[PDB]
Design a protein around this ligand. Structure first.
Ligand SMILES: CCCCCCCCCCCCCCCCCC(=O)OC[C@H](COP(=O)([O-])OCC(O)COP(=O)([O-])OC[C@@H](COC(=O)CCCCCCCCCCCCCCCCC)OC(=O)CCCCCCCCCCCCCCCCC)OC(=O)CCCCCCCCCCCCCCCCC
Ligand SMILES: CCCCCCCCCCCCCCCCCC(=O)OC[C@H](COP(=O)([O-])OCC(O)COP(=O)([O-])OC[C@@H](COC(=O)CCCCCCCCCCCCCCCCC)OC(=O)CCCCCCCCCCCCCCCCC)OC(=O)CCCCCCCCCCCCCCCCC
Ligand SMILES: CCCCCCCCCCCCCCCCCC(=O)OC[C@H](COP(=O)([O-])OC[C@H](O)COP(=O)([O-])OC[C@H](COC(=O)CCCCCCCCCCCCCCCCC)OC(=O)CCCCCCCCCCCCCCCCC)OC(=O)CCCCCCCCCCCCCCCCC
Ligand SMILES: CCCCCCCCCCCCCCCCCC(=O)OC[C@H](COP(=O)([O-])OCC[N+](C)(C)C)OC(=O)CCCCCCCCCCCCCCCCC
Ligand SMILES: CCCCCCCCCCCCCCCCCC(=O)OC[C@H](COP(=O)([O-])OCC[N+](C)(C)C)OC(=O)CCCCCCCCCCCCCCCCC
Ligand SMILES: CCCCCCCCCCCCCCCCCC(=O)OC[C@H](COP(=O)(O)OCCN)OC(=O)CCCCCCCCCCCCCCCCC
Ligand SMILES: CCCCCCCCCCCCCCCCCC(=O)OC[C@H](COP(=O)(O)OCCN)OC(=O)CCCCCCCCCCCCCCCCC
Ligand SMILES: CCCCCCCCCCCCCCCCCC(=O)OC[C@H](COP(=O)(O)OCCN)OC(=O)CCCCCCCCCCCCCCCCC
Ligand SMILES: C=C(C)[C@H]1Cc2c(ccc3c2O[C@H]2COc4cc(OC)c(OC)cc4[C@@H]2C3=O)O1
Lengths: 347, 80, 171, 120, 105, 110, 167, 98
């Protein structure tokens, strides 16, 4: 791909997210999602292989169905309110359809069935874009319509996402599918605290984006897409195994790491509202994703591995890959918990 | 500036006429004196009813009849 | 809610201007010239009251002044007006531009026998002022009392009392 | 929660009333922790590119510490501002609604009857 | 997040198509211009929580202008009782509702 | 209403003439034919260039759809803004054509 | 019977979608969507949206379904289909019988059973179609809308030329 | 409310159920998607014309244009699938299950 055209297409992805973030009219929200989808389709087809065409077709169909449901929700809002402001909705049917459509755009359960496939078919940088930047716009629309969001629907979608993201990644050896089920579980964690405190939703979104960006940047720095190729990293660069160690421990929620920061605050904002059972079983399910993270770093990151002779050629060359923001993102994804009251800047 | 222009006029006269007419269409309304009158005629065209004003007592610039000499006129349009 | 009040059928009886649209269109410039004041009192009352039930009598004055407009044509210049609205009436779009000599005969006979000057280009579209005696409607929308706004922020901004107060963070 | 507050003057990182609040000192322990995060970032940057960790790029580690302290100073100003706004709204709401926060009568323990549970 | 760039920069990107009460071409009113204006002027500034309970009557008048469910319900009741009295024969239509009176203006 | 009468009449006359054409020589008992093409039985290969010119038609037809209210838009009172956006839309159609040009998309059906 | 003509077209419109969502083939699916676009366009034209009806004919049918039939020709050379067809048709005709015997129905929303000629307006608009002047307002009031739509179509051209290349 | 709105929404839900669970040609899925767009066009048009809300008359054209561009994008994906398998059968899109 021509780098000028790549810059233009990435600016169009960013422009669609910005149009969803800033616009007051529902048609411009829909336009921003259309622009974002239309622009992100070539980023997935960067390498031009049939897995990326399958992934882009599945992503197209899911985001197009979600966009049609979003426009039907906007249209029922126009029936029952005669106007177009991006605020609370004026019909529970529009509320249900827009919550369903945004759940399809995020990849929340029961519409999760594309997120492990599409992330598998596309490269690591486009999977980084999909799992970080493509979460910003529907969380903004959910942030603005929360007076109309049905609590039972958003909590059903949230805990279904957390259970399916927990019990879907236990079986996984592919790193992109582990990140995709982790995505589904974290979107459940973001949307369950949405009607209680949306600032903690934003906190979970930013800490998730930092940790996911750290993980995909380490994946691009090591060129590892599987568990077993990740095991061959200590004999090439030993620090990269340490960084995927501390960042995967952070994404499951170990104290005293920074990825313990959001969900603890989320539990802290769900017991204020007298919900005890729900964050309890929610973090019970998060213990399962932490547990396969601890298998996936105990059994296959710490204790050192059989290597191959051609690796001794790769000792003679350093990494010339641009590891952009990787030490900053690794420090922020691990050592940020002593600054836990920074969350007030997101209020 | 005239070697490349004669070269493209010998090779691609369709595109020379295209870029020239497009350039004229862009720059020429900023140079025409009649572009003001387009605006003036499109605001002088009464699609709606001229809703009258309640006479408060002091509106000298508002007429009391259509045939009164004060108010907006269209003699600039009748002459042109 | 309530019962919507409607006027009786005797309150709606007025002698109608029972002429065709080409007849109205033929004399329309002299109509807007000569029947200015009751028409504008009616349209002022109609945009201000926002209610046609409050605009019946002024409307009757319109239908009083239009008929006297046509009687004053019928007493003096019935034949050039008839020759003019017939030519207006032939056209499917009712063009003024196809009918200029009949317009000239009608305007000549009207200026001679009635002294009426036809309005120029741009006169009948003027915003004019209307001196009436009826009072200004203090609530034309019948709006109820608006809800009181929330209290605004006042007072100088003090620091947070012992910081964030988040579990053990002392700042 | 407080999104109707910063909607009258939107997209202000630090508003004008934030200048009425005491800014953090440069020896703020939060800001010192942020500078330590910058030093850790410089060490991880020399570690991932196989440089001498404590030796190479002292200007680069200096810009890491400088840039994290620089960003974190304004982040801590906004943090302190938002907790100050939270307490200001809390206190003005309690003052504007005296019926909802009644001064409950303080009873000393000579009137308070607590049930004694013996450990035996 | 709603980063309000339009108010921060003072530009009008899409506030104009947002409501029916806004400035239309050639001053065309919507059918429920007055009702939407009344409900917007009721609910302005008081927040959505106070607006859902303190501007219920304006919003019901505006939603019933939009959908005309009460009006169609009343027309259904009148037309159904009229059809019943036509089938029973206790009512006859007048000449101005049968089309025999050569309309007014 | 008269429009639907006209459309229905044209469809009726077309269906009448097509039915008479398909069934006036079927009165004949001519002969029964067994009759046991440039390609024989090969599958039709996909032509990428035909699809590219169809999508280029679709996208320029959408840009035409944006251009269609211009005779009504020339009647506005905001003529500077209107003229600017009209020249911007025709320029963006020209830029889409220039990108279709220079990236060899208009080749072998140029 | 002529008073319900919009309603009658709407029934055909529903039938038309059950005509092609049963999906015997993309060929006949395209044919059913073209007939459905025609009858829904008749629905649009009967409310006074003449320009939007000609946008259905020029752009949806004449522009886009041509490209669907073209790609169906070039790229794509029962029991489930007929069963889903007759199932949806029985559902729709039972809905028609309900709403015509009751003049009131509730599936998701409450719906009146009289014709939609009642819900119109009794005024006039002078020397213009309001829908025509509202679409003319795209160039005077709709500046940001024109900008984002033109940029989306330019990006659409660029994106199609990227992913159809295969290199 | 209006009775034609029920038929347009029922058409939308018919084409939505036709999109969701069939596992057939990919072109048939794109046809169901554009039937959903068609019903959205008709419904937006009848509402905006019903309420005489003049500035939203340009709204369905926008709803047309973007989505038709969307449709073009989908066809190109189909063509890439049609350049990979020779068919648009969506059960050929099962490489990413493992
Ligand atoms: C506010 C948010 C700011 C977020 C970060 C913005 C910058 C990064 C994003 C863009 C990017 O990639 O830029 C390249 C990027 C380098 O990223 P990299 O490739 O990953 O770095 C690896 C090596 O450093 C590569 O080394 P090199 O061999 O190429 O040369 C050394 C290089 C050379 O440097 C230069 O050339 C810079 C001087 C010229 C600048 C341009 C002038 C025109 O120096 C550095 O890179 C030193 C480290 C710079 C700081 C990186 C982190 C910045 C702070 C991030 C926010 C932390 C927040 C903590 C919050 C905690 C509480 C919650 O940044 C720079 O080169 C300049 C950074 C300037 C920071 C300004 C801070 C104040 C802003 C107001
Ligand atoms: C500081 C903490 C972060 C340091 C990260 C980098 C450390 C590093 O590179 O160490 C090597 C370096 C010495 O090595 P070298 O001779 O230069 O070359 C290294 C060889 O090439 C290395 O030889 P090799 O690579 O050929 O083979 C040996 C192999 C051996 O590799 C293995 O055997 C594989 C790993 C074994 C299992 C894992 C062991 C534990 C590592 C992870 C830590 C887990 C616990 C953390 C807490 C729980 C969270 C999980 O790999 C290494 O040893 C790799 C070198 C790096 C090792 C240390 C990495 C620490 C990063 C993780 C901790 C920090 C982040 C998470 C913190 C979470 C919250 C507390 O040591 C240091 O730089 C340590 C710092 C010493 C100076 C301290 C000065 C303090 C100044 C304070 C004032 C300044 C700030 C003022 C602020 C205010 C201003 C206004
Ligand atoms: C006239 C104008 C100029 C005047 C100049 C005057 C000053 C001149 C000297 C300039 C230097 C000033 C240094 C900062 C001020 C003092 C800070 C302090 O002692 O805080 C006490 C602070 C609480 O004690 P305090 O009695 O309440 O306050 C006494 C002071 O008034 C402290 O003030 P405070 O009461 O306002 O404390 C506020 C609050 C007090 O804290 C609280 O209210 C509780 C919340 C604390 C966070 C808890 C997080 C727990 C989960 C995460 C654990 C992470 C793993 C542990 C560390 C592993 C390695 C990174 O702070 C926070 O919440 C912020 C977080 C803690 C930051 C502490 C400063 C760190 C700078 C150096 C970083 C190096 C690593 C330090 C340890 C990192 C972990 C904290 O202690 C701790 O939280 C324990 C950690 C140890 C303190 C850090 C000592 C700084 C110097 C370290 C030198 C050695 C470095 C060795 C190499 C690197 C490590 C491997
Ligand atoms: C739109 C304006 C133009 C319309 C078309 C032209 C107008 C005239 C149309 C009718 C012409 C006569 C019938 C079609 C031509 C018949 C030619 C033919 O081969 O006929 C032999 C055929 C068959 O005769 P046959 O039995 O000898 O068949 C020969 C074939 N073998 C021997 C193998 C069986 O005749 C018919 O089919 C008779 C059909 C009806 C003839 C006319 C009846 C009266 C019409 C008034
Ligand atoms: C490249 C950008 C070309 C167009 C720039 C704006 C042209 C213009 O005059 O717009 C005026 C128009 C309309 O302003 P106006 O001056 O016509 O305002 C008069 C008020 N009305 C419209 C009600 C009659 O737009 C704006 O002022 C704001 C919206 C667009 C702002 C520019 C966005 C550029 C984005 C680039 C990426
Ligand atoms: C309230 C919300 C408001 C908005 C808040 C801000 C949200 C920020 C979200 C960040 C999302 C970043 C997505 C990725 C960057 C975008 C551009 C991109 O993809 O760059 C990667 C680039 C691709 O180059 P290419 O040649 O294609 O690589 C293939 C390898 N041969 O180059 C590479 O592949 C090089 C390898 C390293 C790339 C690392 C990129 C890290 C980017 C994330 C930084 C951390 C997030 C920002 C801070 C937190 C914000 C929430
Ligand atoms: C600023 C004004 C408005 C501009 C925007 C509106 C433009 C309207 C017309 C739209 C045209 C759309 C497509 C344009 C593509 C241009 C690039 C191009 O065609 O380059 C290739 C060509 C060589 O041709 P080739 O590649 O071989 O193609 C097969 C034909 N042999 O190489 C060429 O043909 C060379 C083309 C460049 C030289 C043309 C110079 C014309 C000068 C006319 C007088 C001045 C006009 C003022 C504006 C300046 C224009 C440069
Ligand atoms: C790194 C920090 C870079 C900050 C750049 C400037 C950002 C800025 O000023 O944002 C304005 C925003 C407050 O604007 P407001 O409309 O109140 O936000 C509502 C959000 N739901 O303020 C903020 O959003 C401040 C918090 C930004 C944190 C970004 C990194 C995490
Ligand atoms: C295989 C995976 C995923 C995990 C589980 C696990 C390890 C590594 C080591 C051990 C371990 O199991 C635990 C079980 O119980 C305790 C409890 C302990 O304290 C409560 C304790 O303290 C050090 C140690 C232990 C075991 C221990 O050494 O990796």
């Amino acid at each position: 791909m021509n780098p000028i055209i790549l810059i233009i297409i990435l600016m169009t992805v960013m422009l669609g997210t910005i149009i969803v973030m800033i616009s007051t009219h529902w048609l411009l929200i829909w336009i921003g999602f259309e622009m974002n989808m239309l622009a992100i389709i070539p980023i997935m087809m960067k390498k031009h292989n049939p897995r990326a065409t399958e992934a882009s077709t599945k992503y197209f169909l899911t985001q197009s169905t979600a966009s049609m449901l979003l426009m039907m929700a906007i249209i029922i809002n126009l029936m029952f309110s005669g106007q177009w402001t991006v605020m609370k909705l004026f019909n529970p049917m529009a509320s249900m359809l827009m919550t369903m459509a945004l759940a399809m755009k995020l990849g929340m359960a029961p519409f999760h069935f594309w997120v492990p496939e599409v992330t598998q078919g596309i490269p690591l940088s486009s999977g980084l874009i999909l799992l970080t930047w493509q979460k910003l716009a529907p969380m903004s629309v959910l942030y603005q319509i929360l007076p109309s969001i049905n609590l039972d629907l958003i909590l059903t979608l949230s805990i279904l996402s957390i259970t399916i993201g927990g019990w879907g990644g236990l079986n996984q050896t592919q790193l992109r599918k582990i990140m995709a089920y982790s995505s589904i579980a974290h979107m459940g964690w973001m949307t369950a605290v949405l009607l209680y405190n949306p600032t903690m939703t934003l906190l979970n979104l930013i800490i998730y984006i930092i940790m996911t960006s750290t993980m995909f940047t380490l994946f691009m720095a090591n060129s590892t897409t599987t568990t077993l190729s990740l095991s061959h990293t200590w004999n090439k660069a030993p620090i990269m195994t340490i960084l995927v160690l501390i960042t995967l421990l952070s994404m499951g929620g170990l104290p005293p790491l920074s990825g313990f920061m959001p969900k603890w605050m989320i539990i802290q904002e769900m017991t204020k509202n007298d919900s005890i059972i729900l964050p309890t079983l929610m973090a019970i399910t998060a213990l399962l994703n932490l547990y396969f993270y601890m298998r996936l770093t105990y059994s296959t990151a710490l204790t050192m591995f059989p290597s191959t002779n051609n690796m001794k050629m790769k000792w003679q060359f350093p990494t010339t890959k641009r590891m952009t923001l990787l030490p900053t993102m690794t420090v922020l994804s691990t050592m940020l918990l002593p600054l836990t009251p920074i969350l007030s800047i997101l209020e | 500036v005239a070697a490349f222009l004669k070269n493209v006029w010998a090779k691609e006269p369709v595109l020379v006429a295209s870029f020239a007419i497009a350039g004229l269409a862009v720059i020429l309304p900023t140079l025409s004196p009649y572009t003001k009158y387009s605006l003036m005629i499109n605001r002088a065209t009464p699609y709606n009813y001229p809703v009258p004003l309640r006479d408060d007592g002091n509106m000298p610039d508002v007429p009391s009849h259509p045939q009164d000499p004060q108010g907006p006129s269209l003699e600039w349009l009748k002459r042109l | 809610p309530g019962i919507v009040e409607l006027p009786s059928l005797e309150d709606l009886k007025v002698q109608e201007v029972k002429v065709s649209s080409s007849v109205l269109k033929a004399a329309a410039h002299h109509y807007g010239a000569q029947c200015d004041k009751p028409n504008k009192e009616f349209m002022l009352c109609r945009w201000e009251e926002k209610d046609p039930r409050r605009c019946l009598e002024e409307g009757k004055l319109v239908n009083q002044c239009a008929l006297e407009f046509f009687r004053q044509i019928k007493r003096h210049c019935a034949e050039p007006f008839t020759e003019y609205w017939t030519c207006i009436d032939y056209s499917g779009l009712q063009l003024f531009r196809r009918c200029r000599k009949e317009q000239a005969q009608f305007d000549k006979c009207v200026l001679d026998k009635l002294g009426w000057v036809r309005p120029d280009l741009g006169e009948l579209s003027k915003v004019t002022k209307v001196k009436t005696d009826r009072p200004l409607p203090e609530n034309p929308y019948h709006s109820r009392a608006r809800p009181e706004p929330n209290p605004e922020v006042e007072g100088d901004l003090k620091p947070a009392r012992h910081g964030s107060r988040l579990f053990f963070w002392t700042m | 929660m407080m999104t109707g507050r910063q909607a009258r003057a939107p997209l202000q990182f630090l508003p004008d009333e934030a200048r009425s609040l005491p800014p953090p000192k440069l020896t703020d322990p939060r800001l010192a922790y942020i500078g330590f995060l910058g030093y850790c970032s410089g060490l991880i940057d020399n570690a991932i590119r196989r440089r001498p960790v404590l030796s190479a790029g002292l200007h680069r580690q200096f810009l890491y510490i400088t840039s994290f302290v620089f960003v974190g100073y304004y982040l801590l100003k906004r943090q302190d501002y938002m907790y100050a706004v939270r307490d200001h709204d809390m206190f003005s709401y309690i003052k504007s609604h005296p019926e909802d926060f009644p001064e409950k009568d303080k009873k000393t323990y000579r009137e308070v009857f607590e049930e004694f549970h013996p450990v035996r | 997040p709603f980063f309000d760039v339009q108010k921060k920069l003072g530009v009008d990107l899409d506030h104009w198509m947002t409501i029916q009460s806004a400035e239309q071409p050639h001053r065309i009113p919507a059918r429920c211009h007055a009702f939407e204006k009344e409900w917007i002027e009721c609910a302005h500034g008081i927040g959505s929580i106070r607006a859902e309970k303190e501007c219920k009557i304006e919003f019901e008048d505006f939603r019933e202008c939009l959908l005309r469910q009460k009006t169609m319900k009343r027309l259904n009741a009148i037309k159904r009782q009229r059809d019943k009295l036509i089938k029973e024969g206790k009512y006859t239509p007048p000449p101005h509702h049968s089309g025999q009176e050569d309309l007014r203006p | 209403m008269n429009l639907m009468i006209t459309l229905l009449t044209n469809f009726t006359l077309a269906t009448l003439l097509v039915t008479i054409a398909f069934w006036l020589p079927q009165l004949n008992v001519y002969s029964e034919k067994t009759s046991p093409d440039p390609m024989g039985s090969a599958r039709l290969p996909f032509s990428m260039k035909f699809f590219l010119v169809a999508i280029t038609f679709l996208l320029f037809d959408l840009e035409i759809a944006l251009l269609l209210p211009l005779p009504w838009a020339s009647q506005t009172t905001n003529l500077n803004t209107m003229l600017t956006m009209a020249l911007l839309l025709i320029f963006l159609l020209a830029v889409s054509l220039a990108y279709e040009w220079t990236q060899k998309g208009l080749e072998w059906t140029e | 019977m002529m008073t319900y003509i919009v309603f009658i077209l709407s029934i055909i419109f529903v039938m038309g979608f059950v005509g092609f969502s049963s999906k015997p083939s993309p060929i006949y699916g395209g044919l059913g969507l073209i007939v459905s676009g025609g009858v829904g366009c008749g629905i649009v034209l009967n409310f006074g949206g003449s320009f939007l009806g000609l946008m259905v004919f020029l752009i949806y049918l004449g522009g886009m379904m041509v490209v669907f039939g073209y790609t169906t020709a070039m790229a794509t050379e029962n029991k489930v289909v007929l069963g889903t067809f007759i199932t949806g048709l029985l559902m729709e005709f039972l809905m028609v019988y309900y709403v015509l015997k009751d003049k009131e129905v509730e599936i998701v929303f409450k719906f009146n059973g009289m014709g939609d000629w009642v819900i119109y307006d009794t005024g006039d608009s002078g020397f213009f179609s309001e829908e025509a002047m509202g679409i003319a307002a795209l160039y005077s009031y709709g500046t940001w809308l024109v900008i984002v739509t033109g940029w989306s179509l330019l990006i659409g051209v660029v994106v199609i030329m990227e992913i159809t290349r295969g290199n | 409310m209006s009775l034609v709105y029920m038929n347009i929404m029922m058409a939308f839900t018919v084409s939505l159920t036709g999109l969701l669970m069939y596992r057939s040609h990919l072109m048939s899925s794109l046809l169901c998607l554009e039937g959903m767009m068609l019903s959205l066009f008709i419904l937006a048009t009848l509402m905006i014309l019903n309420s005489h809300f003049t500035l939203a008359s340009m709204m369905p054209i926008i709803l047309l244009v973007f989505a038709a561009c969307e449709a073009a994008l989908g066809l190109s994906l189909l063509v890439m699938v049609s350049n990979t398998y020779g068919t648009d059968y969506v059960q050929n899109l099962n490489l990413l299950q493992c």
